[PDB]
Amino acid sequence: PKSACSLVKPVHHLVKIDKSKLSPRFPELKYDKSDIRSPGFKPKDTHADRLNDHYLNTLQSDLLLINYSHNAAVVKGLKQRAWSGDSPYHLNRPPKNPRGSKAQLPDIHPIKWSNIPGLESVVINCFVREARENQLLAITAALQLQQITGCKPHPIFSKNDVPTWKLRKGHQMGAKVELKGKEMSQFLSTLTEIVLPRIREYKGISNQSGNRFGGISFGLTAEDIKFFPEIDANQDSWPKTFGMHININTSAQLDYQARTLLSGFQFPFFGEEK
Amino acid sequence: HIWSDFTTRPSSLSIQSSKVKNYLFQKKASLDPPSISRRSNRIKYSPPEHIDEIFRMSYDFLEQRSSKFYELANKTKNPLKKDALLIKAEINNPEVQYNFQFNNKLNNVKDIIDYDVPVYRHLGKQHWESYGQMLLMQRLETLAAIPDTLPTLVPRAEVNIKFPFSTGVNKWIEPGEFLSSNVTSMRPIFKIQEYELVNVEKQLYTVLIVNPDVPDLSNDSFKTALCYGLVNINLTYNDNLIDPRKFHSSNIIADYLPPVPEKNAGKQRFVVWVFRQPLIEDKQGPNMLEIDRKELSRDDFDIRQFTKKYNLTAIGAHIWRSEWDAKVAAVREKYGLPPGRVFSRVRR
Amino acid sequence: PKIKVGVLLSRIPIIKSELNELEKKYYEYQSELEKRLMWTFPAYFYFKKGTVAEHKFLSLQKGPISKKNGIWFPRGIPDIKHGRERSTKQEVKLVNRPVIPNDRITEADRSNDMKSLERQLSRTLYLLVKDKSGTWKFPNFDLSDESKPLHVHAENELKLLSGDQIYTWSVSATPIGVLQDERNRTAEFIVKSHILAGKFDLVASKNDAFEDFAWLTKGEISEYVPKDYFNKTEFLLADN
Amino acid sequence: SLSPLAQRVVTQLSVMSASRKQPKLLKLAREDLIKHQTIEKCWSIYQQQQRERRNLQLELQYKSIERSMNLLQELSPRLFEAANASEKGKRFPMEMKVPTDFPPNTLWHYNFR
Amino acid sequence: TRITLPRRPAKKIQLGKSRPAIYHQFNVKMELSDGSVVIRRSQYPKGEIRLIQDQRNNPLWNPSRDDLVVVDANSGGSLDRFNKRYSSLFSTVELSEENKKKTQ
RNA sequence: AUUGAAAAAAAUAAUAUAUAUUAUAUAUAUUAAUUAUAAAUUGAAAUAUGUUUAAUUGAAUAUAUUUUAGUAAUAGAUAAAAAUAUGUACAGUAAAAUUGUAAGGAAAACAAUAAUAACUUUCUC
């Protein structure tokens, strides 16, 4: 190679060129995944969704009313500070970090008819630490996820080398899955309706849980996983079962709004709130 | 049921094949798809279950929406709004979609795809923008046809070119393609398809083919030559194939001279530009313009000055490429041109 | 102007909403597409070798047609893997008394009882009351103490009215709407709330503003209530 | 040579895998493709109208909230402050359950506490 | 020391030929403690199931109800035998006899 | 072509046949496959003459031939776990820190963390 010097030549027109349409290659990837001609086609709306219908029919209006605040205004977040131009050395100086944080934080807008909180995704994390010695437990965990949820699990691979825990790097330690729409609706419905009621001593979810910008996380143990219908039906095929974390990601601007939304979906809360 | 009506709606908004019409609008799944010609394959085929009644209901829904759009269109006055509402009314028609998707869009048949109809015009615009326009712009930019000849281009018409008289074979030239001297010896024919609202009864077009690569030894550089030029040409949405049938000698400001590159003179680019003339109001009849033929250079051309002086706006373009071969001498002799020059192999 | 506190009590749907014919047909069509593009059932994992369950499942199932040389198959040579013909959908048939679902239509439905809290298990009901005149309207209350908030006043008034037979939860302290007047120079503030358990059962017999009650949905409210009142209060009511 | 645990997990990952379980590609005639296109366009338009109707209802409700708040602010500041008091810790009643697709034996409960 | 099953050469799934994963599921009916039934998608070949302990009979999810009976699995373990074994004592007499101890 | 059934069609592309051009083009025809590849007495299917059986039919037995089961990860132009360190074409953006989450703790794995004025298509008052 004569040189390593990236440089994009400017154009003389405003027409946007996508070369995937000019290449005769990959004819079947030109169709959208929603197009019946695409091999990636998968029917989406096969049946009505009770949880979504309930949220659209009842909870949107109630949440709007509850979160209404008169003459509210946007609360801007911690952003990068700017150097005052009292010294020449400030001319090309990069901006300063936010006051309390090394990362910028989002602004909080008043709740209005267009931005009511709602569920956007659910992610299940299953990290079998005992899979460090046995790689097959990862496959078992993936099957547990597939049976509980119905979606394709994705493997989790070790990234750090910690000797005290005897954790190497590049090995399969478990599985994950992300849920949206009817599938997450079903997963949450079955959780609340079957599994959580069958836990020994269950008070709810901690009121001091969740990332500070919307999203609530809580865990389940192996005995708790045994309550799901699929496992109970064929106990024989489940000598061992694994726990997992559950992360519910919503549109809530702050965590307490998400807590109210989940309580609407019947998720109990026990601790004292921040 | 406005889509079943054809008192005022053009007849092209319907599938001209009775078999396919009946199958698409069938009541029970008793017929078979006309697309599958072989009976064997027809028996093998099995349509998705519960598809005709859902189709009937979706048809009814879309047809009610189209009826509302027609209601508002019959009352709108501005031609742009009228055309937009017509497009929105007929865009979702299964018959229109069938016709456009599965019939020719270049050599269109008036009774299937009529470009006098806003919906067909809009669907054609979308189809062109999907693939054809992007390729044209890529070829122009990469081969440096834009800055060399004209500052920019905002494509608004599809231009296709062909060389039917030279050899006898039929082929639309891909932009940027290399053509033999024999292929490009005789004359090109154009096809300028317009997709916007333009007054067919007043608008006139010009076409200039230029070569911005003819060497010039006075300053050790290149220069531009006007290969071909036509002015005062009128088109129609469905009859827009320019050929010696559709123009006179008064339209010709520079008769066609062929691509005749010189040996080791490099790969020459022949670029086609289509402009539309000014459209004066308060006057009846097309506004024809007279070209100053004693000022036209024809060998030291300046296209930017030409278009600026005659107030022309480009709407379409095309391009091909040429290089020396054995038939160049024969073409020179046939056209009465002097013997070609021969340049060195090295650029020093 | 004099302040007044109105309340609308809502009963939420108890069962999933009904589907319009378009929704039903779309869902069945998509379900058949899914079945057509559906994977083979891995019975080799859900039924172990040589077990009675496996035997009975196999007996229930009907096998496909295998390809055999010397025969003509007009629909195409069979292509089977794991017991399914890949060119078509695959149909699998399957204190222990069978599940008998409950009817979605109730005795209140058939008897057209306008007061029972079962007249529509899938719709949303709203409490309406009749004044001295012939104008149905949402319950309203007067107040002069002003030592209590609007929603608390509404809840206590409803409790006293029903005579300790209604359980009501206030969605929020914020009023949801206002109705102004000029003749009587009154401003009436509405508050939203839901019914959780109990029965309304108008009690007071000394001729309060309330005469007769009903639990109507949006359409019946449109049919009962005055047109202007409906235009002024319609958006506060849920479609389903 | 494999262990019975190996066979069990291979069966589990067989249930994972798509090998020897998917049917043939769905190839539709041109007419049925057009039918399907019309179905999807109808459904998309319908869902957009439903979403916009809900959005309009919420817009109107929010307008009502703000009008009522202005009126109450100018009429009685005490009640306005009581209303504007935050509900940060609010939770929904635990029997406001999501609707199911067939009703229960006891439709409604007429006694409490 | 770790045990793993070997990786076979992965079959190449070309660009555009990659199909989605639609596992086989059944429209199974699920009965709660009350008479309510929910339709759901399950991969187990069991079209019908009923639950003995679930949301509809849990105090935390059912605060308003006055009376709420609880139950566990039957025909398993020695449950309820601590009552079946003693028939002489039966249900308020014991409550009265548990009045006080009179110890200090 | 046969095979449940009374003029023929008018697109991109692919395949078969053929011939125009010192032009990888045109005409007619059709619309296949797209997760597969040896080796299985033993699991499961479909195919005949007795059969019991009611014109059938049927369900069950016996054999000949064939089919399925070798059950194996990526289903995404995958994107900062480990594996191909040289070419080309297409495409994307890391890292720390903070807040949470079963075992989980300083340290394992997942999720969240800057702003939408302007421009389009669609829906809607």
PDB file of C-alpha atoms (C1' of nucleotides) in Angstrom, chain F:
ATOM      1  C1'   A F   1     -48.089 -32.410 -21.818  1.00  0.00           C
ATOM      2  C1'   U F   2     -50.545 -35.505 -18.475  1.00  0.00           C
ATOM      3  C1'   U F   3     -52.379 -33.984 -13.506  1.00  0.00           C
ATOM      4  C1'   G F   4     -58.748 -30.876  -9.228  1.00  0.00           C
ATOM      5  C1'   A F   5     -59.967 -26.320 -14.565  1.00  0.00           C
ATOM      6  C1'   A F   6     -63.453 -22.889 -18.355  1.00  0.00           C
ATOM      7  C1'   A F   7     -57.694 -17.551 -26.757  1.00  0.00           C
ATOM      8  C1'   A F   8     -52.019 -15.264 -25.276  1.00  0.00           C
ATOM      9  C1'   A F   9     -49.260 -12.270 -22.672  1.00  0.00           C
ATOM     10  C1'   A F  10     -46.862  -6.701 -22.051  1.00  0.00           C
ATOM     11  C1'   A F  11     -41.539  -5.481 -15.073  1.00  0.00           C
ATOM     12  C1'   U F  12     -36.275  -5.792 -12.951  1.00  0.00           C
ATOM     13  C1'   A F  13     -33.410 -10.309 -12.653  1.00  0.00           C
ATOM     14  C1'   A F  14     -32.130 -15.794 -13.105  1.00  0.00           C
ATOM     15  C1'   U F  15     -32.206 -20.262 -16.221  1.00  0.00           C
ATOM     16  C1'   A F  16     -32.787 -22.830 -21.489  1.00  0.00           C
ATOM     17  C1'   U F  17     -32.623 -22.179 -26.755  1.00  0.00           C
ATOM     18  C1'   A F  18     -31.341 -19.129 -30.898  1.00  0.00           C
ATOM     19  C1'   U F  19     -28.808 -15.359 -33.648  1.00  0.00           C
ATOM     20  C1'   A F  20     -27.480  -9.554 -34.371  1.00  0.00           C
ATOM     21  C1'   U F  21     -22.857  -6.478 -33.732  1.00  0.00           C
ATOM     22  C1'   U F  22     -15.222  -5.678 -34.827  1.00  0.00           C
ATOM     23  C1'   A F  23     -21.746  -3.161 -29.104  1.00  0.00           C
ATOM     24  C1'   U F  24     -21.124  -9.022 -22.184  1.00  0.00           C
ATOM     25  C1'   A F  25     -27.492  -7.263 -26.955  1.00  0.00           C
ATOM     26  C1'   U F  26     -32.007  -8.926 -28.399  1.00  0.00           C
ATOM     27  C1'   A F  27     -36.454 -12.619 -29.057  1.00  0.00           C
ATOM     28  C1'   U F  28     -39.472 -16.528 -27.264  1.00  0.00           C
ATOM     29  C1'   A F  29     -40.035 -19.737 -23.083  1.00  0.00           C
ATOM     30  C1'   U F  30     -40.452 -20.624 -17.556  1.00  0.00           C
ATOM     31  C1'   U F  31     -40.345 -18.491 -12.575  1.00  0.00           C
ATOM     32  C1'   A F  32     -36.495 -23.895  -9.680  1.00  0.00           C
ATOM     33  C1'   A F  33     -33.619 -23.753  -4.905  1.00  0.00           C
ATOM     34  C1'   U F  34     -32.028 -20.612  -1.042  1.00  0.00           C
ATOM     35  C1'   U F  35     -29.238 -24.527   5.514  1.00  0.00           C
ATOM     36  C1'   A F  36     -28.075 -29.125   2.218  1.00  0.00           C
ATOM     37  C1'   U F  37     -23.614 -33.150   1.626  1.00  0.00           C
ATOM     38  C1'   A F  38     -21.378 -40.674   2.993  1.00  0.00           C
ATOM     39  C1'   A F  39     -21.710 -44.376   7.153  1.00  0.00           C
ATOM     40  C1'   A F  40     -27.802 -46.104  11.430  1.00  0.00           C
ATOM     41  C1'   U F  41     -30.125 -54.602  12.421  1.00  0.00           C
ATOM     42  C1'   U F  42     -32.268 -51.578  17.285  1.00  0.00           C
ATOM     43  C1'   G F  43     -36.514 -44.829  17.331  1.00  0.00           C
ATOM     44  C1'   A F  44     -40.546 -42.786  13.822  1.00  0.00           C
ATOM     45  C1'   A F  45     -43.089 -42.522   9.083  1.00  0.00           C
ATOM     46  C1'   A F  46     -45.393 -43.617   3.951  1.00  0.00           C
ATOM     47  C1'   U F  47     -46.356 -47.515   0.208  1.00  0.00           C
ATOM     48  C1'   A F  48     -50.212 -54.742  -1.072  1.00  0.00           C
ATOM     49  C1'   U F  49     -52.584 -59.271  -0.420  1.00  0.00           C
ATOM     50  C1'   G F  50     -55.186 -62.238   3.388  1.00  0.00           C
ATOM     51  C1'   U F  51     -57.805 -59.876   7.877  1.00  0.00           C
ATOM     52  C1'   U F  52     -61.377 -58.576  11.130  1.00  0.00           C
ATOM     53  C1'   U F  53     -64.195 -55.889   9.125  1.00  0.00           C
ATOM     54  C1'   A F  54     -70.133 -51.789   6.812  1.00  0.00           C
ATOM     55  C1'   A F  55     -69.882 -49.766  -1.941  1.00  0.00           C
ATOM     56  C1'   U F  56     -66.937 -48.620   0.806  1.00  0.00           C
ATOM     57  C1'   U F  57     -64.340 -47.700   4.489  1.00  0.00           C
ATOM     58  C1'   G F  58     -61.895 -48.781   8.500  1.00  0.00           C
ATOM     59  C1'   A F  59     -58.314 -49.853  12.062  1.00  0.00           C
ATOM     60  C1'   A F  60     -55.047 -53.922  13.384  1.00  0.00           C
ATOM     61  C1'   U F  61     -51.292 -57.671  12.094  1.00  0.00           C
ATOM     62  C1'   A F  62     -47.199 -60.076   8.472  1.00  0.00           C
ATOM     63  C1'   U F  63     -43.299 -59.099   4.558  1.00  0.00           C
ATOM     64  C1'   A F  64     -40.793 -55.961   0.192  1.00  0.00           C
ATOM     65  C1'   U F  65     -39.150 -51.149  -1.161  1.00  0.00           C
ATOM     66  C1'   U F  66     -38.345 -46.496   0.180  1.00  0.00           C
ATOM     67  C1'   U F  67     -38.181 -41.943   3.729  1.00  0.00           C
ATOM     68  C1'   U F  68     -36.782 -39.798   8.126  1.00  0.00           C
ATOM     69  C1'   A F  69     -33.313 -39.724  13.061  1.00  0.00           C
ATOM     70  C1'   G F  70     -25.664 -38.822  12.516  1.00  0.00           C
ATOM     71  C1'   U F  71     -30.133 -34.874  16.274  1.00  0.00           C
ATOM     72  C1'   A F  72     -23.920 -29.168  16.892  1.00  0.00           C
ATOM     73  C1'   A F  73     -24.091 -23.023  18.505  1.00  0.00           C
ATOM     74  C1'   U F  74     -23.288 -17.755  13.915  1.00  0.00           C
ATOM     75  C1'   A F  75     -30.089 -16.520  11.178  1.00  0.00           C
ATOM     76  C1'   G F  76     -26.717 -10.430  11.665  1.00  0.00           C
ATOM     77  C1'   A F  77     -22.972  -7.336   5.801  1.00  0.00           C
ATOM     78  C1'   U F  78     -22.625  -9.538  12.751  1.00  0.00           C
ATOM     79  C1'   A F  79     -19.124  -4.207  14.828  1.00  0.00           C
ATOM     80  C1'   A F  80     -14.343  -3.229  20.820  1.00  0.00           C
ATOM     81  C1'   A F  81     -15.122 -11.728  24.413  1.00  0.00           C
ATOM     82  C1'   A F  82     -11.229 -15.211  21.990  1.00  0.00           C
ATOM     83  C1'   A F  83      -9.836 -17.032  16.747  1.00  0.00           C
ATOM     84  C1'   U F  84      -6.735 -15.157   9.446  1.00  0.00           C
ATOM     85  C1'   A F  85      -1.324  -9.488  11.305  1.00  0.00           C
ATOM     86  C1'   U F  86      -0.821  -9.095   3.329  1.00  0.00           C
ATOM     87  C1'   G F  87      -5.598  -7.142  -1.323  1.00  0.00           C
ATOM     88  C1'   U F  88     -10.063  -4.953  -2.379  1.00  0.00           C
ATOM     89  C1'   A F  89     -15.607  -3.221  -1.539  1.00  0.00           C
ATOM     90  C1'   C F  90     -19.295  -1.859   2.084  1.00  0.00           C
ATOM     91  C1'   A F  91     -20.262  -0.150   6.930  1.00  0.00           C
ATOM     92  C1'   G F  92     -19.639   1.469  12.124  1.00  0.00           C
ATOM     93  C1'   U F  93     -17.276   4.215  16.685  1.00  0.00           C
ATOM     94  C1'   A F  94     -14.302   3.433  20.994  1.00  0.00           C
ATOM     95  C1'   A F  95     -12.519   4.312  26.651  1.00  0.00           C
ATOM     96  C1'   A F  96     -13.101   5.808  31.496  1.00  0.00           C
ATOM     97  C1'   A F  97     -16.435   7.274  35.184  1.00  0.00           C
ATOM     98  C1'   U F  98     -21.550   7.258  37.473  1.00  0.00           C
ATOM     99  C1'   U F  99     -26.392   4.818  38.715  1.00  0.00           C
ATOM    100  C1'   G F 100     -28.577   0.109  39.432  1.00  0.00           C
ATOM    101  C1'   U F 101     -29.080  -5.450  39.198  1.00  0.00           C
ATOM    102  C1'   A F 102     -29.593 -13.260  42.140  1.00  0.00           C
ATOM    103  C1'   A F 103     -25.219 -15.360  44.203  1.00  0.00           C
ATOM    104  C1'   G F 104     -21.679 -10.368  43.338  1.00  0.00           C
ATOM    105  C1'   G F 105     -18.080  -7.891  47.109  1.00  0.00           C
ATOM    106  C1'   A F 106     -12.951  -2.501  45.016  1.00  0.00           C
ATOM    107  C1'   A F 107     -12.581  -6.159  41.149  1.00  0.00           C
ATOM    108  C1'   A F 108     -17.155 -11.530  36.927  1.00  0.00           C
ATOM    109  C1'   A F 109     -22.009  -9.997  33.520  1.00  0.00           C
ATOM    110  C1'   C F 110     -26.302  -6.800  31.619  1.00  0.00           C
ATOM    111  C1'   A F 111     -28.771  -2.219  31.227  1.00  0.00           C
ATOM    112  C1'   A F 112     -28.934   3.453  31.307  1.00  0.00           C
ATOM    113  C1'   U F 113     -26.109   8.333  31.089  1.00  0.00           C
ATOM    114  C1'   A F 114     -25.128  15.394  25.386  1.00  0.00           C
ATOM    115  C1'   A F 115     -28.906  18.999  21.878  1.00  0.00           C
ATOM    116  C1'   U F 116     -33.135  18.607  17.859  1.00  0.00           C
ATOM    117  C1'   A F 117     -33.444  24.525  15.238  1.00  0.00           C
ATOM    118  C1'   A F 118     -33.786  23.235  10.027  1.00  0.00           C
ATOM    119  C1'   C F 119     -35.342  19.157   5.565  1.00  0.00           C
ATOM    120  C1'   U F 120     -38.322  14.929   3.892  1.00  0.00           C
ATOM    121  C1'   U F 121     -42.534  10.804   3.851  1.00  0.00           C
ATOM    122  C1'   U F 122     -46.809   9.411   6.579  1.00  0.00           C
ATOM    123  C1'   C F 123     -51.024  10.155  10.117  1.00  0.00           C
ATOM    124  C1'   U F 124     -54.156  13.753  12.301  1.00  0.00           C
ATOM    125  C1'   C F 125     -57.072  18.503  14.296  1.00  0.00           C
TER     126        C F 125
END
